[PDB]
From a paper:
Here we use X-ray crystallography to determine the PlsY structure at 1.48 Å resolution using crystals grown in an activity-supporting lipid bilayer environment, revealing a 7-TMH fold. By contrast, rod-shaped aaPlsY crystals were obtained in LCP made of 7.8 monoacylglycerol (MAG), a powerful host lipid for several crystallization projects. The structure (named as aaPlsYMAG) contains one complete aaPlsY monomer in each asymmetric unit. The striking shortness of TMH4 (n = 11) is compensated by the membrane-embedded Loop3. The overall structure is very compact; apart from two relatively long cytoplasmic loops containing functionally important residues, the helices are stitched together with short linkers. As noted, MAG resembles acylP and lysoPA; and indeed, the MAG molecule in the active site is almost superimposable with the lipid substrate and product. Thus, the collective poses of the MAG molecules near the gate are reminiscent of the snapshots for the exchange of acylP and lysoPA between the active site and the membrane. Despite the different states, the five structures are superimposable with root-mean-square deviation values within 0.52 Å, suggesting a lack of flexibility.
Numbering used by the authors: 0 to 198
The structure:
Amino acid sequence: MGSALFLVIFAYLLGSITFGEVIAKLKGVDLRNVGSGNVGATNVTRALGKKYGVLVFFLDFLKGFIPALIAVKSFGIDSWVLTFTGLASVLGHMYPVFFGFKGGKGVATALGVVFAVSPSVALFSFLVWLGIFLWKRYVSLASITATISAFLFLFVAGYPVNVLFMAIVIGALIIYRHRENINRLLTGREHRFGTLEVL
Ligand SMILES: CCCCCCC/C=C/CCCCCC(=O)OC[C@@H](O)CO
Ligand SMILES: CCCCCCC/C=C\CCCCCC(=O)OC[C@@H](O)CO
Ligand SMILES: CCCCCCC/C=C\CCCCCC(=O)OC[C@@H](O)CO
Ligand SMILES: CCCCCCC/C=C\CCCCCC(=O)OC[C@@H](O)CO
Ligand SMILES: CCCCCCC/C=C\CCCCCC(=O)OC[C@@H](O)CO
Ligand SMILES: CCCCCCC/C=C\CCCCCC(=O)OC[C@@H](O)CO
Ligand SMILES: CCCCCCC/C=C\CCCCCC(=O)OC[C@@H](O)CO
Ligand SMILES: CCCCCCC/C=C\CCCCCC(=O)OC[C@@H](O)CO
Ligand SMILES: CCCCCCC/C=C\CCCCCC(=O)OC[C@@H](O)CO
Ligand SMILES: CCCCCCC/C=C\CCCCCC(=O)OC[C@@H](O)CO
Ligand SMILES: CCCCCCC/C=C\CCCCCC(=O)OC[C@@H](O)CO
Ligand SMILES: CCCCCCC/C=C\CCCCCC(=O)OC[C@@H](O)CO
Ligand SMILES: CCCCCCC/C=C\CCCCCC(=O)OC[C@@H](O)CO
Ligand SMILES: CCCCCCC/C=C\CCCCCC(=O)OC[C@@H](O)CO
Ligand SMILES: CCCCCCC/C=C\CCCCCC(=O)OC[C@@H](O)CO
């Protein structure tokens, strides 16, 4: 259907709005040259402050939630339209047409996709993330662990193959976007998150 193609294209274009760069540019800051140089909510928190980072997280989450919600309600949980809508949102966040195809790691937007599929699974995956983050204070370790957990939760809950395909590809892409963090974690060179007073 034409409406299926338009929903997927809409999801990619919406995901291509790198809200970390939007907010930082509104503030005259080049997010690629402050902090870690990454463009997600974590680096916004690191460079501009937790309140700006919460805003960016919410906006990047909504990019994934809104199109996936439309897909679920219009085409059904079993539809491969949902599969490609969720993938398009995440791929837009990672490879944004509006920001030189240099985007983020995909965690916030992927959580938004999952929330449209299953708010409970999204909550459980967030709880894993927060637990792992508070355990060791590595953002990357929390995101990798929670991404794997999210797939396992959808699998054991019995979600259909279109959803599992969407989740395994999104999850693999997220882990790939963390490949440098994994290298640092394996060699003891990953930094814990926070100011010197917090740490
Ligand atoms: C840009 C500033 C304004 C805020 C943006 C709007 C945020 C929320 C939008 C509502 C979500 C989209 C509607 C989803 C929905 O219920 O779709 C179900 C529909 O497909 C039933 O067939
Ligand atoms: C790079 C993609 C974005 C720019 C181009 C967007 C539009 C491109 C091609 C038009 C495809 C229209 C397909 C409509 C279609 O098959 O509708 C049939 C359906 O509505 C009922 O069977
Ligand atoms: C990077 C992603 C690119 C996506 C490109 C999507 C467009 C692909 C194929 C176009 C299909 C032709 C549809 C033309 C059309 O409106 O025909 C009407 C006809 O199908 C109804 O009888
Ligand atoms: C169809 C719904 C779309 C919802 C999102 C709407 C788009 C919102 C933000 C993206 C563009 C923000 C650009 C703001 C702006 O002009 O900032 C200028 C300033 O950053 C200096 O370059
Ligand atoms: C299997 C595919 C779906 C994966 C869903 C996403 C991973 C699940 C849970 C983590 C969500 C909480 C993220 C908390 C947070 O502050 O993230 C900041 C963000 O910038 C990290 O890159
Ligand atoms: C449409 C419904 C929206 C539901 C909520 C969407 C936003 C989800 C999560 C935002 C929380 C991210 C921050 C997580 C967090 O507390 O990180 C740990 C750290 O802050 C502890 O110091
Ligand atoms: C204008 C701003 C919001 C843009 C949202 C774009 C959403 C794209 C398409 C809307 C969904 C159309 C669904 C058509 C429909 O009834 O499909 C039913 C489907 O199950 C086939 O029988
Ligand atoms: C619905 C349309 C939304 C459009 C949102 C605005 C996107 C367009 C222009 C904003 C600036 C894009 C370039 C940002 C960028 O990556 O700058 C280059 C970077 O290497 C700076 O270090
Ligand atoms: C699949 C549908 C595609 C529809 C057309 C999308 C492309 C339209 C306009 C491009 C927006 C601004 C792109 C410029 C851009 O990303 O520049 C930033 C880059 O130089 C950062 O190094
Ligand atoms: C539903 C699947 C749609 C596929 C869309 C894929 C995402 C959007 C554009 C593809 C870019 C492919 C090339 C990779 C790329 O962006 O290079 C990385 C960038 O950092 C260098 O400019
Ligand atoms: C489906 C997504 C749901 C996520 C939205 C809810 C986020 C709300 C709260 C998370 C943060 C909890 C408080 C963390 C905190 O106070 O940590 C203190 C800790 O650093 C002490 O060592
Ligand atoms: C397995 C999924 C659940 C999430 C991971 C569970 C790991 C267990 C506990 C995490 C709670 C946060 C505090 C852990 C801890 O020892 O923090 C030390 C810190 O508070 C003081 O240096
Ligand atoms: C805090 C720790 C939480 C850990 C949750 C553990 C979930 C992981 C593995 C359990 C495997 C259960 C057996 C396989 C299973 O349910 O298959 C899924 C599917 O075939 C059911 O439709
Ligand atoms: C069974 C299917 C397996 C599919 C292959 C796994 C894809 C995941 C990660 C890609 C790892 C290699 C990176 C590719 C690469 O150099 O891309 C860089 C840039 O030009 C485009 O992103
Ligand atoms: C949900 C099932 C479990 C998934 C666990 C995924 C863990 C992924 C990558 C971790 C690789 C590094 C292992 C060592 C590590 O984290 O060390 C932390 C610190 O002590 C030194 O960097």
